[PDB]
Design a protein around this motif. Structure first.
Motif, PDB file in Angstrom:
ATOM      1  N   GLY A 109     120.392  82.265  76.822  1.00 59.55           N
ATOM      2  CA  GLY A 109     119.513  81.580  77.924  1.00 59.55           C
ATOM      3  C   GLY A 109     119.608  79.958  78.093  1.00 59.55           C
ATOM      4  N   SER A 110     118.519  79.797  78.712  1.00 57.78           N
ATOM      5  CA  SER A 110     118.359  78.303  78.890  1.00 57.78           C
ATOM      6  C   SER A 110     117.171  77.687  77.977  1.00 57.78           C
ATOM      7  N   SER A 111     117.200  76.985  77.219  1.00 59.76           N
ATOM      8  CA  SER A 111     116.173  76.713  76.413  1.00 59.76           C
ATOM      9  C   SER A 111     115.309  75.423  77.137  1.00 59.76           C
ATOM     10  N   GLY A 112     116.053  74.544  77.544  1.00 63.48           N
ATOM     11  CA  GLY A 112     115.356  73.162  78.356  1.00 63.48           C
ATOM     12  C   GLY A 112     114.292  72.693  77.475  1.00 63.48           C
ATOM     13  N   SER A 113     113.512  72.007  78.233  1.00 66.94           N
ATOM     14  CA  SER A 113     112.422  71.415  77.594  1.00 66.94           C
ATOM     15  C   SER A 113     112.807  70.046  77.003  1.00 66.94           C
ATOM     16  N   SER A 114     112.244  68.849  77.454  1.00 70.43           N
ATOM     17  CA  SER A 114     112.562  67.636  77.128  1.00 70.43           C
ATOM     18  C   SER A 114     114.048  67.369  77.440  1.00 70.43           C
ATOM     19  N   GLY A 115     114.391  65.986  77.539  1.00 71.99           N
ATOM     20  CA  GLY A 115     115.877  65.666  77.885  1.00 71.99           C
ATOM     21  C   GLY A 115     116.476  64.611  76.916  1.00 71.99           C
TER      22      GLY A 115
END
Length: 119
Positions: A1-7
């Protein structure tokens, strides 16, 4: 999936304060940055088992504000912060590299700061 959160984000290299022990010694303890006070003395902390050492011989405080450390004697035995003797109820400062002879001018705790390279 896509964890994401923060860059991404980073100001400097920064680091962390800690104490360095000589061979046949304990691991590198990471002083509390929160500002707390890490009381050193007899115990597994520094592996010190000398009666001359008191559970609360001194009070170390990691000061990443200026890469320093505050030391306060809460024991009885006179501690040495580098090349100067302390007193009971006194307080001093330790610089990066400075030593902190728990007691009996022994069990020196070399102050070190973490700092990675490249970047």
């Amino acid at each position: 999936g896509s964890s994401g959160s923060s860059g991404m984000s980073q100001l400097g290299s920064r680091g962390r304060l800690w104490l360095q022990s000589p061979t046949g010694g304990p691991p590198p303890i990471f002083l509390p940055s929160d500002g707390q006070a890490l009381v050193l003395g007899r115990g597994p902390l520094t592996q010190v088992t000398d009666r001359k050492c008191s559970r609360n011989q001194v009070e170390l405080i990691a000061d990443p504000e200026s890469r320093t450390v505050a030391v306060k004697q809460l024991g009885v035995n006179p501690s040495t912060v580098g090349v100067q003797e302390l007193k009971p109820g006194l307080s001093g400062s330790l610089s990066l590299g400075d030593v902190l002879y728990l007691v009996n001018g022994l069990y020196p705790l070399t102050l070190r700061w973490s700092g990675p390279s490249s970047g």
